[PDB]
Amino acid sequence: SRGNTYQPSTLKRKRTFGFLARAKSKQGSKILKRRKLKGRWFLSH
Amino acid sequence: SALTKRTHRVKVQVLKDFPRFQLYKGQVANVKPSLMRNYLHNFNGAKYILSEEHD
């Protein structure tokens, strides 16, 4: 039985999608800049 | 090329005897550039001459 694909764990989620993860890599930086340009309020977890 | 190999020389005064190459010290010879660069010139064993003031 599918449907329950997101299996929350705070550690994994901060480590993968978190602000610090984004800011550490060049690709991540691009993403953050993109979100800033769009004016998103929340740049990442 | 072959022609280039045959004919292209560089003029140098050797500052040391080189038995193998038959270039005795002090003498001014026209040698192949490879020879100059890879053997002679190392350790001030020779010196290029572009003109008579280089001598």
Binding site: - | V10, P33, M36, R37, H41, N42, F43, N44, K47, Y48, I49, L50, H54
Partner: protein, 146 residues
């Protein structure tokens, strides 16, 4: 020839100082290269390429079927004597450059040739080498006391 991928490089013009938010810890040992370091074929920055770069063109068949290809310069790693430094200096060397060196009589001569073209077709490493050589020469000429 043209030195289009050298003389087109531009570097942030320094503001002269009669402080900045971030100053470097070390001291600039070498003089700034006019044209800076190449961000194009960075393989070239390690040695003496004579302003030759990778070309990109088309492989073409008997059916005129285009397909991208690159062209590399004939680089050779080569330890060559420097009278002024009193040691052999090994570097990457386009064979053309080697030939030029041979013609001109020594690596020092090659480095220390005045023309702007020569300056252009040195790398940053080349520039550094030149600086070393000329400084050394100066030292030799002119001890502290006359």
């Amino acid at each position: 020839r043209q030195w289009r991928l050298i003389e087109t490089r531009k570097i942030a013009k320094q503001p002269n100082y009669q402080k900045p938010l971030h100053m470097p810890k070390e001291r600039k040992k070498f003089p700034d290269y006019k044209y800076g370091e190449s961000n194009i074929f960075k393989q070239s920055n390690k040695g003496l390429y004579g302003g030759s770069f990778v070309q990109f063109g088309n492989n073409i068949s008997e059916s005129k079927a285009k397909t991208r290809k690159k062209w590399l310069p004939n680089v050779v790693k080569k330890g060559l004597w420097s009278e002024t430094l009193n040691r052999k200096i090994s570097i990457k060397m386009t064979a053309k450059v080697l030939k030029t060196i041979s013609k001109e009589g020594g690596i020092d001569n090659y480095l220390t040739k005045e023309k702007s073209a020569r300056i252009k077709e040195l790398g940053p490493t080349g520039w550094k080498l030149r600086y070393r050589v000329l400084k050394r020469k100066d030292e030799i000429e002119n001890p502290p006391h006359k």
